[PDB]
Design a protein around this motif. Structure first.
Motif, mmCIF file in Angstrom:
data_model
loop_
_atom_site.group_PDB
_atom_site.id
_atom_site.type_symbol
_atom_site.label_atom_id
_atom_site.label_comp_id
_atom_site.label_asym_id
_atom_site.label_seq_id
_atom_site.Cartn_x
_atom_site.Cartn_y
_atom_site.Cartn_z
ATOM 1 N N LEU A 66 0.841 -1.196 0.000
ATOM 2 C CA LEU A 66 0.000 0.000 0.000
ATOM 3 C C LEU A 66 0.879 1.250 0.000
ATOM 4 N N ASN A 67 2.123 1.030 -0.385
ATOM 5 C CA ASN A 67 3.192 2.018 -0.434
ATOM 6 C C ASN A 67 3.164 2.991 -1.623
ATOM 7 N N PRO A 68 2.892 2.580 -2.924
ATOM 8 C CA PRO A 68 3.090 3.545 -4.022
ATOM 9 C C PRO A 68 2.098 4.694 -4.069
ATOM 10 N N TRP A 79 -4.896 7.197 0.146
ATOM 11 C CA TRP A 79 -5.748 6.087 0.574
ATOM 12 C C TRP A 79 -6.800 6.547 1.578
ATOM 13 N N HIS A 90 -41.037 -4.633 -13.579
ATOM 14 C CA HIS A 90 -41.864 -5.696 -14.131
ATOM 15 C C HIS A 90 -42.379 -5.333 -15.523
ATOM 16 N N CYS A 147 -42.557 -7.608 -17.809
ATOM 17 C CA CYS A 147 -43.116 -8.889 -18.223
ATOM 18 C C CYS A 147 -44.634 -8.793 -18.253
#
Ligand SMILES: CCCCCCCC/C=C/CCCCCCCC(=O)O[C@@H](COC(=O)CCCCCCCCCCCCCCC)COP(=O)([O-])OCC[N+](C)(C)C
Ligand SMILES: CCCCCCCC/C=C\CCCCCCCC(=O)O[C@@H](COC(=O)CCCCCCCCCCCCCCC)COP(=O)([O-])OCC[N+](C)(C)C
Ligand SMILES: CCCCCCCC/C=C\CCCCCCCC(=O)O[C@@H](COC(=O)CCCCCCCCCCCCCCC)COP(=O)([O-])OCC[N+](C)(C)C
Ligand SMILES: CCCCCCCC/C=C\CCCCCCCC(=O)O[C@@H](COC(=O)CCCCCCCCCCCCCCC)COP(=O)([O-])OCC[N+](C)(C)C
Ligand SMILES: CCCCCCCC/C=C\CCCCCCCC(=O)O[C@@H](COC(=O)CCCCCCCCCCCCCCC)COP(=O)([O-])OCC[N+](C)(C)C
Ligand SMILES: CCCCCCCC/C=C\CCCCCCCC(=O)O[C@@H](COC(=O)CCCCCCCCCCCCCCC)COP(=O)([O-])OCC[N+](C)(C)C
Ligand SMILES: CCCCCCCC/C=C\CCCCCCCC(=O)O[C@@H](COC(=O)CCCCCCCCCCCCCCC)COP(=O)([O-])OCC[N+](C)(C)C
Ligand SMILES: CCCCCCCC/C=C\CCCCCCCC(=O)O[C@@H](COC(=O)CCCCCCCCCCCCCCC)COP(=O)([O-])OCC[N+](C)(C)C
Ligand SMILES: *[C@@H]1O[C@H](CO)[C@@H](O[C@@H]2O[C@H](CO)[C@@H](O)[C@H](O)[C@H]2NC(C)=O)[C@H](O)[C@H]1NC(C)=O
Ligand SMILES: *[C@@H]1O[C@H](CO)[C@@H](O[C@@H]2O[C@H](CO)[C@@H](O)[C@H](O)[C@H]2NC(C)=O)[C@H](O)[C@H]1NC(C)=O
Ligand code: NA
Ligand code: NA
Ligand code: NA
Ligand code: NA
Lengths: 115, 303, 101, 51, 51
Positions: E1-3, E9, E38, E40
């Motif tokens: 989670l470094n770059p 973050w 709906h 149908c």
């Protein structure tokens, strides 16, 4: 090796003691003797180390912490799977007449196969 | 398969069966995934959880390879599986494109051998030496160590590891797979003009050269006051830098890093070929399973 | 149909999705291995087009006299036996002595 | 861009590579035989180490 | 989670809840995203959202 000095068996002010040694020390130098003794005091622990390098070829040492958050991301699935199961059981006990004994019957219904 | 150090390839594969099978357990235990696959009516009592164990693998593999799936769960207990298994994908697939970008532009050719001891264990390298020079007189009288075991190599396969001169073997090591035992003054001379042939290992012996002198002379007391004078001013080193220099090879260019061919990746035309043949066998394998059911359904089995 | 079998053959290779989504085990492996054929090819393409455009950015044309000394491909050239080689043959700077070599 | 940065870097392996590392300070035994070689060197790689 | 730094973050997750809630507001407020699920049997007055 930057420099090439070299040690030496010393010899006094000009004397033929250098000539009996320079002969005799080359017999120790060529056969085995200056390697059998150099590996007798410069030996050490014989320490093996580092398996030399992995060198940015990603293993468990760097991205292994996502298997922590994948383990942590499934623990919060089981504890909420109880929470959804308690939420409708509290709702369905309110509906018809009956108490939490039917919540176990809701487990007896949902333990079945594909319906 | 190189850029992720196959501990991770075995952990992800054991997590693609892990989070998959738990999502089967969470779904059947959760009430909201018990909805209707036929929502035209309110219900025909056809209320059925979609997640079978075949579909349980399908959201596992289908989310790990960025293509998606068909299920896309509804219950919040099956969103937390779908919210972490997706984030498990965008680091594994975004470290694969990270490392394989970082292995094509910057490559370091690792040698399998680094010394005379790490070279000693592998008999597939066909060592060799210069026959009847000054090197063979060292290993013949060698009763010291590892180097005694290398003498058992050369005595077993003579006329193939005993090249008659220096120059014929340099032509031999340029074609075959070979690893000299010769003088470390000539190795410093060959590796500067013929840059395919590096010096692995280091010193094993130290004879040392020297100006000759007849038996009994007053020269040698004044020769050594001239040689040791040249060591300290660096003139003996600056002349050594002058002759053995030659061309020189600053070989770091990375060579347009790589037009990637079959030579690097060709296993995905092998794992593709060993995948489709596996599915033809399970096609007939379930074709007999329908015949196994039809054996029990009407009356007839094999006809 | 064959009109739709290219659609899972093309759409799975270009990561935009599909329309079929196969539903049984004999088409889950072909549906599954072909996804792994995509994610290696497309991530040996993004991970290699990066590896061209950071290679020809590390390289730069020569700007000095010591940088040309590290370039044995580009051969030097000079006016012969004149005032230019006069400075180079008696230099002890050892950067220009490498140019004399 | 992290994993191609810490792959371009490498530990020092020679005496000229340490001359380009002004972070890592040299250290030696003082006024002895080691500095004797370094103060009269005209190689100009080791004169940079003397600087 | 470094770059990405710990400021991105913290903001991406605060932009995830920032767009999950605004899209929840607009989809209820908009007239077109009301529809019967709906078709149908159409014209049923059973208007529901996916939102
Ligand atoms: C749109 C909604 C997005 C939600 C995303 C939330 C992300 C949270 C981010 C918060 C940022 C805060 C900064 C610091 C937090 C540290 C986190 C970490 O690294 O691991 C920590 C736990 O891991 C977790 O935090 C849980 C993650 C798994 C479950 C998440 C399910 C999400 C479902 C959403 C539904 C709502 C339920 C969840 C509500 C939060 C602890 O790790 P450790 O201490 O280093 O372990 C070593 C301990 N030892 C040294 C002793 C061995
Ligand atoms: C019942 C629920 C479902 C659970 C299972 C789900 C099924 C599928 C799950 C996973 C499938 C795939 C993963 C398994 C592979 C092994 C894991 C591994 O690699 O170890 C890693 C864990 O790192 C650590 O060991 C550090 C200490 C961890 C302490 C506990 C972590 C939980 C965090 C808080 C939990 C509560 C969070 C609460 C948040 C509010 C790294 O290992 P390592 O130590 O760095 O060195 C390598 C050692 N090794 C070679 C042996 C590996
Ligand atoms: C480590 C221990 C575990 C951690 C403890 C965790 C604490 C407890 C965790 C989650 C709480 C609930 C868990 C079980 C219920 C499932 C959720 C659900 O279905 O959503 C329902 C909203 O809920 C409602 O029914 C309407 C009331 C709104 C509630 C607040 C907004 C929800 C926001 C997010 C929720 C919370 C997010 C997190 C908040 C911080 C959906 O509505 P519905 O009525 O179901 O739809 C009709 C039903 N029908 C389709 C069958 C007709
Ligand atoms: C399925 C798990 C992955 C595979 C298992 C391993 C994991 C275990 C982890 C580590 C152990 C690995 C060591 C095994 C060595 C045996 C030899 C071998 O197989 O490789 C050979 C072929 O390769 C294959 O044929 C296998 C891959 C295709 C079949 C499996 C996927 C198909 C669908 C899956 C269906 C189930 C679905 C599962 C859903 C999750 C190599 O080919 P070769 O001829 O040697 O070429 C050499 C050429 N050379 C000399 C130039 C170099
Ligand atoms: C190198 C050569 C090697 C290969 C050839 C070797 C030569 C040998 C020759 C022949 C042998 C090969 C026989 C074929 C095998 C599968 C047959 C089949 O499809 O029937 C069944 C299995 O298919 C599945 O779907 C798997 C999961 C079963 C679903 C639940 C049943 C019980 C689960 C407990 C166990 C599960 C597994 C437990 C863990 C393993 C069909 O299942 P279904 O219920 O109808 O699927 C519903 C699909 N739906 C969801 C879309 C509605
Ligand atoms: C990324 C995804 C992977 C696969 C991509 C697709 C497969 C690969 C496609 C073609 C393979 C190429 C042959 C190899 C020759 C290489 C030479 C070259 O560079 O370009 C050549 C080909 O130019 C093209 O490739 C045009 C692109 C094709 C578009 C059609 C694909 C859409 C498919 C979907 C349709 C849906 C079907 C219906 C669905 C229901 C010509 O260029 P040149 O003249 O040689 O230039 C030389 C310059 N140089 C010397 C400086 C080098
Ligand atoms: C980024 C993607 C994310 C993860 C992907 C999934 C995780 C698991 C994936 C891979 C797990 C691999 C574990 C060990 C690593 C290989 C080591 C090895 O020795 O391989 C060898 C044998 O092994 C093989 O030939 C098999 C090749 C592995 C690919 C599996 C594809 C199956 C797709 C899965 C899904 C199917 C879908 C079905 C749907 C139901 C071959 O190499 P070698 O002969 O040793 O070559 C020597 C050269 N060398 C010395 C330099 C190496
Ligand atoms: C109904 C809801 C509507 C809103 C949607 C809500 C959801 C999404 C909203 C935002 C997503 C997440 C919120 C915080 C992150 C935003 C940026 C940030 O990092 O903070 C910023 C502080 O700026 C502030 O302090 C203002 C805080 C008020 C919040 C809304 C402002 C944006 C709208 C009006 C925008 C007007 C701009 C002009 C438009 C043409 C930091 O500055 P920066 O910008 O990151 O960097 C530039 C400065 N620098 C170069 C020196 C470094
Ligand atoms: C790159 O190095 C390899 C080293 O293996 C070279 O491969 C050898 O090539 C010769 C051709 O003269 C063959 O006789 C050997 O059998 C090869 N060695 C093997 C297969 O292990 C290769 O030629 C080199 N490539 C270039 C362009 O220099
Ligand atoms: C191994 O030796 C060299 C090193 O690459 C290759 O040919 C040399 O190429 C350089 C230019 O890069 C020339 O300066 C040399 O004169 C070449 N030497 C020889 C002997 O040709 C050679 O192709 C490599 N591979 C093989 C199989 O020999
Ligand atoms: Na890149
Ligand atoms: Na996608
Ligand atoms: Na999709
Ligand atoms: Na990408």
């Amino acid at each position: 090796l930057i420099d090439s000095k070299g040690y030496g068996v010393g010899t006094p002010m000009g004397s033929p003691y250098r000539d009996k040694i320079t002969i005799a020390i080359l017999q120790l130098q060529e056969e085995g003797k200056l390697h059998m003794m150099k590996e007798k005091w410069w030996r050490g622990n014989g320490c093996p180390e580092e398996e030399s390098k992995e060198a940015s070829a990603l293993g468990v040492q760097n991205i292994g912490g996502i298997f922590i958050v994948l383990a942590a991301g499934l623990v919060l699935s089981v504890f909420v799977a109880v929470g959804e199961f308690l939420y409708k059981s509290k709702k369905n006990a309110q509906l018809e007449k009956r108490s939490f004994c039917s919540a176990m019957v809701e487990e007896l219904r949902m333990s079945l196969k594909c319906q | 398969l190189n850029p992720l150090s196959p501990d991770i390839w075995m952990y992800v594969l054991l997590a693609c069966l892990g989070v998959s099978c738990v999502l089967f357990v969470i779904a059947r235990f959760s009430p909201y995934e018990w909805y209707n696959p036929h929502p035209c009516n309110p219900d025909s009592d056809v209320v059925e959880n979609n997640f079978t164990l075949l579909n349980s693998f399908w959201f596992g593999v289908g989310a790990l390879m960025q293509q998606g799936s068909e299920l896309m769960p509804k219950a919040l207990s099956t969103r937390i599986v779908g919210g972490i298994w997706w984030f498990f994908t965008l680091i594994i697939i975004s470290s694969y494109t990270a490392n394989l970008a970082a292995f094509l532009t910057v490559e370091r050719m690792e040698s399998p051998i680094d010394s005379a001891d790490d070279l000693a264990k592998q008999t597939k390298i066909e060592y060799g030496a210069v026959e009847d020079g000054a090197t063979m007189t060292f290993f013949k009288k060698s009763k010291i160590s590892t180097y005694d075991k290398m003498w058992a190599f050369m005595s077993s396969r003579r006329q193939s590891v005993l090249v008659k001169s220096n120059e014929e073997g340099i032509q031999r090591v340029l074609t075959s797979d070979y690893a000299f035992l010769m003088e470390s003054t000539t190795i410093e001379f060959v590796t500067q003009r013929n840059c395919n042939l590096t010096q692995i290992g280091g010193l094993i012996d130290s004879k040392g050269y020297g100006v000759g002198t007849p038996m009994g002379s007053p020269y040698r007391d004044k020769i050594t006051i001239a040689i040791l004078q040249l060591q300290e001013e660096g003139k003996l080193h600056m002349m050594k830098e002058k002759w053995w220099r030659g061309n020189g090879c600053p070989e770091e260019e990375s060579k347009e890093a790589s037009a990637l061919g079959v030579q690097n990746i060709g296993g995905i035309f092998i794992v593709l070929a060993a995948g489709l043949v596996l599915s033809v066998f399970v096609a007939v394998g379930e074709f007999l399973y329908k015949s196994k059911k039809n054996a029990q359904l009407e009356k007839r089995s094999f006809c």
